[PDB]
Short mmCIF file of C-alpha atoms in Angstrom, two decimals:
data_model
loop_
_atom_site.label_atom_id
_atom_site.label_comp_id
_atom_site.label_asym_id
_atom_site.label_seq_id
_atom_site.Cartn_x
_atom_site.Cartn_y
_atom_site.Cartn_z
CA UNK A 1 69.34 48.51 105.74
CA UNK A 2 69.25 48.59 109.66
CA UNK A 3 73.29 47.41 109.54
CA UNK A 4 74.16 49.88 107.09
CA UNK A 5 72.68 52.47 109.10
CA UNK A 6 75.22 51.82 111.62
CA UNK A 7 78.33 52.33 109.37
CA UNK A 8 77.08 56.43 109.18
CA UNK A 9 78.28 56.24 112.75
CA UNK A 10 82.08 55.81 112.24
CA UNK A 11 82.70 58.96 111.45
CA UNK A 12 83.16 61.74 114.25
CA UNK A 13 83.17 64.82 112.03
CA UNK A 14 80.57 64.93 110.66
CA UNK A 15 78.30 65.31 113.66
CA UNK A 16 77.84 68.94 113.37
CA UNK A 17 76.89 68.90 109.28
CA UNK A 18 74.45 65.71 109.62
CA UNK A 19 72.21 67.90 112.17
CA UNK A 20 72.66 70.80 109.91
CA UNK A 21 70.53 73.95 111.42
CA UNK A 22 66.68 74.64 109.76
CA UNK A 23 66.96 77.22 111.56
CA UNK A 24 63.46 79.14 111.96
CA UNK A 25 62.09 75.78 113.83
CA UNK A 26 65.04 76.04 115.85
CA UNK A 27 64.85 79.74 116.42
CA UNK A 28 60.91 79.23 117.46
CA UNK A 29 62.16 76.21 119.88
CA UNK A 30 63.50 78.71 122.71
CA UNK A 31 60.33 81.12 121.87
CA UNK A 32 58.35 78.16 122.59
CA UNK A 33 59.51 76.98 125.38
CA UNK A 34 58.78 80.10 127.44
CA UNK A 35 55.22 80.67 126.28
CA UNK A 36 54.54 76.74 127.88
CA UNK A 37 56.44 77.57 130.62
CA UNK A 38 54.73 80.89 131.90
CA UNK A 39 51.25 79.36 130.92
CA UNK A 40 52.13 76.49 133.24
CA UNK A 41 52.88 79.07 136.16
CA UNK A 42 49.91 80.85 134.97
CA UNK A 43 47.97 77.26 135.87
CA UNK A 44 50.02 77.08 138.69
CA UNK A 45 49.33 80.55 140.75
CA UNK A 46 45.67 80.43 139.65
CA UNK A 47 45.34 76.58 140.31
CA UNK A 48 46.21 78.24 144.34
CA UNK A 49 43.91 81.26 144.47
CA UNK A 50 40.74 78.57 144.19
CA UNK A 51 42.08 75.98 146.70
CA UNK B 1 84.84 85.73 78.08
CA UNK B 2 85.29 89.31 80.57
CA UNK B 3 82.16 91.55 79.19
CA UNK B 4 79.80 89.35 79.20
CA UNK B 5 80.10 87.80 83.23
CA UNK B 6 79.84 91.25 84.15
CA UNK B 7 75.87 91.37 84.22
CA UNK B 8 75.45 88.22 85.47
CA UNK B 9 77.15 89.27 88.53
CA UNK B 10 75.20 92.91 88.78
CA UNK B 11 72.06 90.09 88.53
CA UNK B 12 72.95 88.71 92.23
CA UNK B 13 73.61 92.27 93.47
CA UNK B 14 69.65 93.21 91.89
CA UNK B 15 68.46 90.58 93.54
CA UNK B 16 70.03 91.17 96.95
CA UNK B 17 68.56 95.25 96.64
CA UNK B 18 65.52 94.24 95.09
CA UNK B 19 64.76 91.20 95.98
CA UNK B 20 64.06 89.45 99.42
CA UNK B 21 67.31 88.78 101.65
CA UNK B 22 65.73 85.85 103.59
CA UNK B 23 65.53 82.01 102.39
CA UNK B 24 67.28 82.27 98.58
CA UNK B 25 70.38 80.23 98.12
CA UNK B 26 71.98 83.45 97.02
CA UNK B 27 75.34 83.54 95.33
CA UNK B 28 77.96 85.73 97.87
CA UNK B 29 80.94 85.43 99.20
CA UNK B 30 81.09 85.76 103.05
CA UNK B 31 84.25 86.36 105.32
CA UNK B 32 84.97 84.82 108.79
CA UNK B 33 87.32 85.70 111.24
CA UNK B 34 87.49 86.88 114.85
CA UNK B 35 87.93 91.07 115.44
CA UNK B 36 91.38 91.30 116.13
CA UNK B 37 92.44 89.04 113.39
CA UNK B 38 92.43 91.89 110.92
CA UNK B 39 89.83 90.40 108.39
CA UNK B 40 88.89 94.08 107.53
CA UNK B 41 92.88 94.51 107.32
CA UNK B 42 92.54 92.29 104.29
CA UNK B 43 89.60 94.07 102.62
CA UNK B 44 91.44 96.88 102.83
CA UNK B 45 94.69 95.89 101.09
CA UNK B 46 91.94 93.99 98.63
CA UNK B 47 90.28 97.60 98.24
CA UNK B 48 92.41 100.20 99.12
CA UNK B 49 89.71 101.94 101.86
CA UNK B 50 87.52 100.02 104.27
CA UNK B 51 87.10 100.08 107.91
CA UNK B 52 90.14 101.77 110.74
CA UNK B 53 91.73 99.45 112.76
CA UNK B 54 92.07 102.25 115.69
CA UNK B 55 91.38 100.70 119.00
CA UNK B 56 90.10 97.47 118.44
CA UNK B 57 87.62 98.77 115.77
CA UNK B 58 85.95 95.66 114.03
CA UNK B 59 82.35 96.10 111.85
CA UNK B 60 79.56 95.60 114.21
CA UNK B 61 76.83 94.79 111.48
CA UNK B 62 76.66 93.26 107.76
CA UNK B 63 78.56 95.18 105.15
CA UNK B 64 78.43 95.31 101.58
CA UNK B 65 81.21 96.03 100.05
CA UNK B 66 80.19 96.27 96.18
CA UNK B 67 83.59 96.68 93.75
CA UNK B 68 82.59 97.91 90.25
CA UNK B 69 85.29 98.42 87.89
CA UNK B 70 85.43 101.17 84.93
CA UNK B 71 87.70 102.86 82.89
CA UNK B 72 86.79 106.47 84.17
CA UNK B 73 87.85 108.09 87.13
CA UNK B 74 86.52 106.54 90.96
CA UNK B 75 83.95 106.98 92.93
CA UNK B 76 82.71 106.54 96.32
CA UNK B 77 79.16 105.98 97.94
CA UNK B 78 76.89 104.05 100.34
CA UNK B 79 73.10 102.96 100.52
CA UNK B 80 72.14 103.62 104.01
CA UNK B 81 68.99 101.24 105.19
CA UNK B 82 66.18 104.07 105.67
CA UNK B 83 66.48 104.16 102.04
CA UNK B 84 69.10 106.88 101.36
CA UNK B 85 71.41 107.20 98.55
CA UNK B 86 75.11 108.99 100.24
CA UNK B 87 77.50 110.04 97.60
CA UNK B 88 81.11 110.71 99.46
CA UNK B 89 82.64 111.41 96.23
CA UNK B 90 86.67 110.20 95.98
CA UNK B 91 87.48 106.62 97.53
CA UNK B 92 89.83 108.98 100.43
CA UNK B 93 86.54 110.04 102.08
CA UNK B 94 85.39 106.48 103.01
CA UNK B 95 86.90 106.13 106.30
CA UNK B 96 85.37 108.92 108.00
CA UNK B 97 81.95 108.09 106.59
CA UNK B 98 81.54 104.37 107.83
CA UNK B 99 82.72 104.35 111.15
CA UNK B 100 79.99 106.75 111.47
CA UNK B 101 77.45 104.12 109.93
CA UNK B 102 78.76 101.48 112.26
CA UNK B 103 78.13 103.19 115.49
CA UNK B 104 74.51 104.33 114.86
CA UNK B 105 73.62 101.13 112.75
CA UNK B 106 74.24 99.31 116.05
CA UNK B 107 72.51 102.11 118.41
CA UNK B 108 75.56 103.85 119.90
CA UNK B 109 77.53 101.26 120.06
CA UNK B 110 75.69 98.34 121.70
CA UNK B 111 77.74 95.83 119.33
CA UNK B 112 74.93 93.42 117.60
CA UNK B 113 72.67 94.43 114.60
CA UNK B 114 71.41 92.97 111.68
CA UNK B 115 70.57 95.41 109.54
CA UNK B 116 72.75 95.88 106.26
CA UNK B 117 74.72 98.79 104.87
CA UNK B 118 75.61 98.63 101.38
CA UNK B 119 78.93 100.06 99.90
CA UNK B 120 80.02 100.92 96.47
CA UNK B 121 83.51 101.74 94.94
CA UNK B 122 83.86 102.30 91.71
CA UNK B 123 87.63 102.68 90.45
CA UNK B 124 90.00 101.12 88.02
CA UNK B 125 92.16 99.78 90.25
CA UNK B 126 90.05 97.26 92.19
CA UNK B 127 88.94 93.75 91.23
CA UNK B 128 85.10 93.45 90.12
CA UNK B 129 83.32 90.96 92.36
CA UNK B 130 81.42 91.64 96.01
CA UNK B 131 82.17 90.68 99.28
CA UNK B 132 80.16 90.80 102.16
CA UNK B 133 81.43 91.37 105.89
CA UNK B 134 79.69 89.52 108.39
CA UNK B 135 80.40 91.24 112.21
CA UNK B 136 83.92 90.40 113.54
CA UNK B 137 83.79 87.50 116.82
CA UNK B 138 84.68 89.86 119.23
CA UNK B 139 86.29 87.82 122.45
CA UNK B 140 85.56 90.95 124.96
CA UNK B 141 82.34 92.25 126.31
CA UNK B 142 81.26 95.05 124.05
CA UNK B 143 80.04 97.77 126.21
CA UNK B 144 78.35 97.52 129.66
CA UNK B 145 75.64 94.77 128.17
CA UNK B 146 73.95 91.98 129.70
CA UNK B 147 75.28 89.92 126.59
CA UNK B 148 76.46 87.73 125.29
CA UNK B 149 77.07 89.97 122.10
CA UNK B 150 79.59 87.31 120.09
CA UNK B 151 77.29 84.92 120.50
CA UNK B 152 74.59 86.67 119.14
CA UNK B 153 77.48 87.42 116.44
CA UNK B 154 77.77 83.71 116.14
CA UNK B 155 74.10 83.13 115.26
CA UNK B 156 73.73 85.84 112.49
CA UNK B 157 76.75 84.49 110.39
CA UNK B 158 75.31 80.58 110.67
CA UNK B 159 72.05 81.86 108.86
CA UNK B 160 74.44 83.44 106.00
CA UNK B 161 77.17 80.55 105.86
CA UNK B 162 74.26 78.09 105.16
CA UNK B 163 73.27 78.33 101.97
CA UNK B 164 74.69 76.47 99.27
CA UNK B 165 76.16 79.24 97.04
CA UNK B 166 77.93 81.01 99.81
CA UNK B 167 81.35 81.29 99.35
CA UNK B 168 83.19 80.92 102.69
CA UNK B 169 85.93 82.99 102.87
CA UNK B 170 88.37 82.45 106.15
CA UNK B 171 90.85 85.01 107.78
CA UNK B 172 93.97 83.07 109.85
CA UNK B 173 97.17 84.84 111.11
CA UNK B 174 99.94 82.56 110.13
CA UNK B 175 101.43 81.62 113.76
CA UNK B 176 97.82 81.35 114.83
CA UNK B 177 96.75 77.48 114.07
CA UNK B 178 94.46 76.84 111.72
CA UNK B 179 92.16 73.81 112.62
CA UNK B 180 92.37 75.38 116.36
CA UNK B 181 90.73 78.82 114.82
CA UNK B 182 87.01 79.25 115.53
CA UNK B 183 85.75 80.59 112.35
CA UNK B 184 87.30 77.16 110.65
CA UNK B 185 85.44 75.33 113.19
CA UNK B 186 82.02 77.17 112.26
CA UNK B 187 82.42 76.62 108.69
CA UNK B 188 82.72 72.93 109.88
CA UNK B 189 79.72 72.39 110.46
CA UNK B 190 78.07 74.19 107.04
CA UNK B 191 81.68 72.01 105.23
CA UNK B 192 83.10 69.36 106.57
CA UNK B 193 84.90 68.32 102.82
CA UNK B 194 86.65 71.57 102.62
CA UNK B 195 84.92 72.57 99.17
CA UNK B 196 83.10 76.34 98.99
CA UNK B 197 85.75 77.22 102.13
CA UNK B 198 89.06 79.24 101.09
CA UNK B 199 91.63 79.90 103.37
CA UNK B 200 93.32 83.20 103.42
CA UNK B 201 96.50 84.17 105.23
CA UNK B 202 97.71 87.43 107.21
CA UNK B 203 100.10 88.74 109.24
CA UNK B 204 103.36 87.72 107.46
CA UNK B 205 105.12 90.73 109.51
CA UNK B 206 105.26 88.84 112.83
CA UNK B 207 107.06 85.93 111.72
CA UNK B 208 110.37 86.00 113.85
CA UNK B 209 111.20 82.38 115.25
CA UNK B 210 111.61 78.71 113.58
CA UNK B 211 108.07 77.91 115.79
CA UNK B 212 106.10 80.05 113.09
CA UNK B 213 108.01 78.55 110.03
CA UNK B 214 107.03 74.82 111.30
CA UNK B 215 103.35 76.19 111.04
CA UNK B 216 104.36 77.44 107.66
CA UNK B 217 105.70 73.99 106.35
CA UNK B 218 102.60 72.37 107.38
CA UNK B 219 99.77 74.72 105.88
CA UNK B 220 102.79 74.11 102.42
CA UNK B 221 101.81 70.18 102.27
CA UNK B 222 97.79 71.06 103.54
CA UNK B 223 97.08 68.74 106.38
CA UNK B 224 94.14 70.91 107.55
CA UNK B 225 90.79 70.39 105.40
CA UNK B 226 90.80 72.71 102.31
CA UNK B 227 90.59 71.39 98.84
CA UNK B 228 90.25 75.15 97.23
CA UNK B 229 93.81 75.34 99.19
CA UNK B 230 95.49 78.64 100.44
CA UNK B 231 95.93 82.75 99.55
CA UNK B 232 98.56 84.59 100.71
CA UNK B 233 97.67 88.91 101.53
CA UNK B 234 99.88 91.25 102.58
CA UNK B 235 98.49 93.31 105.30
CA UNK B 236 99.69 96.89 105.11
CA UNK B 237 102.23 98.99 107.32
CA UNK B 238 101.29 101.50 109.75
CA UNK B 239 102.52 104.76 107.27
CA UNK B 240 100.57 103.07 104.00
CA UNK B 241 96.71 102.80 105.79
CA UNK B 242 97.58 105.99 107.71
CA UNK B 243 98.76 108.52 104.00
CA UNK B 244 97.02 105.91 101.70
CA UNK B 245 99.72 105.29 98.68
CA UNK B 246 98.20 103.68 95.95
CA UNK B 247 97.33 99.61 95.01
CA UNK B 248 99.11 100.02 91.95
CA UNK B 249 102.13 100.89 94.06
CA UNK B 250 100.99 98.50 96.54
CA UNK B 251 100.86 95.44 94.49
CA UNK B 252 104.40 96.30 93.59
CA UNK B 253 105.03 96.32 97.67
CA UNK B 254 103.10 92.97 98.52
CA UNK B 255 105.01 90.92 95.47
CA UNK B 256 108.35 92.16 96.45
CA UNK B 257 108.20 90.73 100.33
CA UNK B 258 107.28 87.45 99.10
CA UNK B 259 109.21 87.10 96.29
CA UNK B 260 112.99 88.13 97.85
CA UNK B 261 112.63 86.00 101.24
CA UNK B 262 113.10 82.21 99.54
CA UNK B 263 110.56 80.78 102.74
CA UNK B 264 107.53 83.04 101.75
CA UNK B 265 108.60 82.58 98.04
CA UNK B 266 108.09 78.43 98.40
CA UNK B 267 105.04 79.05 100.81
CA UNK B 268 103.52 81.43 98.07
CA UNK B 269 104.52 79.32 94.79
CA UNK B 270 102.99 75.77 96.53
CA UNK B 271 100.02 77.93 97.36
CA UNK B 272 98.93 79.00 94.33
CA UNK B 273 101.45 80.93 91.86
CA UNK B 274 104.09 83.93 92.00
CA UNK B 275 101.33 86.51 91.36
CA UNK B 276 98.79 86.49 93.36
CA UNK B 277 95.40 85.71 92.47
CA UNK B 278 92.69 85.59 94.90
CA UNK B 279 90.57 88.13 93.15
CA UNK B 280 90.54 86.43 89.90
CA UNK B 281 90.08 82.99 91.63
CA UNK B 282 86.97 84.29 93.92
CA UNK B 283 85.57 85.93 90.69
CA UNK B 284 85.97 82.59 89.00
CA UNK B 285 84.29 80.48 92.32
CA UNK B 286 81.24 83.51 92.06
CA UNK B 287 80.62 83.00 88.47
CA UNK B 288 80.96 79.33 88.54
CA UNK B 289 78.78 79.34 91.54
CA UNK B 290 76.07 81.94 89.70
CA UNK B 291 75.46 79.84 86.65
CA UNK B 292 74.93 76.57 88.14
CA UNK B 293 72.49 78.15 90.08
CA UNK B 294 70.08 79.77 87.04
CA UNK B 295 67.19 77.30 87.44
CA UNK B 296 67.51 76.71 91.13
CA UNK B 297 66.74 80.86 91.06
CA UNK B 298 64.41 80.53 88.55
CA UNK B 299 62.43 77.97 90.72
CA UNK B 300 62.49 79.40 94.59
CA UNK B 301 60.65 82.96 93.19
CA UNK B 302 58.00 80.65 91.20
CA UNK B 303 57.56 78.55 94.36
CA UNK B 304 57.73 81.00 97.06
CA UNK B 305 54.28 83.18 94.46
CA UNK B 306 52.84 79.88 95.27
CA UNK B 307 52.84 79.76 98.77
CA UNK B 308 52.28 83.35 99.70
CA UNK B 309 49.56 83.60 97.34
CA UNK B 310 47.51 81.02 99.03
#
């Protein structure tokens, strides 16, 4: 099995198709990413007010 | 046999009114191209009316572009989205109309929105099938926007090209190369085998020098990855948009070009046949693509009770 994994490898066009687009968890991915990053700077600026 | 794939079809469109846009596999046939490449120049000769190429003028949102045909005399009108049913009466009136649509559907002009329009001829002179136009890749920056509005373009025709029963329908000008073309390369990555993509040709008119008829001999044998193979449209003169002279007249003045020139005779004969065909093959692909699909319908609706019942 682990071998013939390797052989779907060879071919170099079909990079784009094999990670074929969900896309609504892909669309909530950049969404996401913001919402963690502000609440960490949230954590952050408060994190100095107290110290 | 004709009558009876009629009603199958007018399911799809019930469906797509009536039903929810989002998620289903949904028969439709969706074209690609960039906005200068004149893919609304082809639904034009394909219809007769459709969108002015003015200034640069590409559509800016989806459009439906519904063809019924019936043996009385035509008619034009449009759904608009806050639920409004416009009748513009004869198919000369369209132009006006939905360049009107265009600009407030995308809030004066800003150049990206999502919301449909939905467009119906009926005449007798137009093949019975629906295509939908996805928003033209512009390459300049439309308006003064902090976008970014082709790539926001880009993202609303991936979500369409998709699904399984989408028809992929691809606009190249024939000095223009094919596999270089970036509405090939999206379709790519939703088929890599060449299978639900067709490729359609324009702009037979600027095709001077032995450079172009090189690219000709080439798209002839196929080395670029199509396996429905190629169409051929002719794409109107500047007097024949401009006083509108009829399709039935028109066919007569695309099948003469091809046919006296021998080059675009052997380009269009290895292509597909001496009369053209596209509209019977893409109404062939739809229903062929509509009833393999039956209990695939059947079985999202039941499912998708299920889950937003509980």
């Amino acid at each position: 099995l682990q071998k013939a994994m390797m052989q779907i490898l060879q071919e170099k066009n079909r990079y784009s198709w094999l990670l074929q687009e969900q896309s609504e968890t892909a669309t909530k991915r950049r969404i996401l990413k913001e919402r963690i990053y502000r609440l960490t700077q949230a954590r952050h600026a408060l994190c100095q007010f107290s110290s | 046999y004709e009558q009876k794939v009629r009603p199958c079809i007018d399911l799809i469109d019930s469906l797509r009114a009536l039903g929810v846009e989002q998620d289903l596999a949904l028969p439709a046939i969706a074209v690609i191209g960039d906005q200068s490449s004149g893919k609304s120049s082809v639904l034009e000769a394909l219809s007769g009316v459709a969108l002015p190429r003015g200034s640069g003028i590409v559509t800016r949102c989806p459009l439906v572009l519904k063809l019924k045909k019936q043996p009385c005399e035509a008619w034009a009108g449009r759904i608009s989205y806050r639920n409004t049913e416009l009748e513009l009466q004869d198919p000369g009136q369209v132009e006006k109309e939905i360049h009107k649509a265009q600009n407030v559907m995308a809030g004066n002009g800003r150049g990206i929105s999502h919301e449909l329009i939905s467009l119906e001829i009926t005449s007798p002179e137009v093949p019975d099938l629906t295509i939908i136009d996805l928003p033209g890749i512009t390459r300049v920056a439309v308006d003064n926007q902090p976008r970014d509005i082709g790539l926001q373009i880009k993202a609303l025709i991936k979500k369409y090209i998709q699904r399984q029963q989408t028809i992929n329908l691809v606009v190249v000008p024939c000095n223009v190369d094919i596999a270089t073309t970036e509405a090939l390369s999206m379709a790519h990555e939703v088929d890599p085998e060449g299978d639900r993509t067709i490729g359609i040709l324009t702009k037979p008119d600027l095709m001077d020098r032995g450079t172009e008829k090189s690219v000709m001999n080439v798209v002839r044998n196929l080395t670029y990855p199509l396996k429905k193979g190629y169409m051929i449209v002719k794409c109107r003169g500047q007097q024949e948009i401009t006083n509108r002279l009829s399709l039935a007249e028109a066919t007569k003045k695309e099948i003469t070009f091809f046919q006296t020139h021998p080059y675009f005779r052997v380009l269009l004969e290895e292509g597909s046949a001496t009369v053209p065909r596209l509209a019977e093959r893409l109404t062939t692909e739809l229903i062929m693509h509509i009833q393999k699909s039956l209990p695939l319908l059947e079985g999202q609706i039941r499912e998708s009770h299920q889950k937003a019942t509980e």
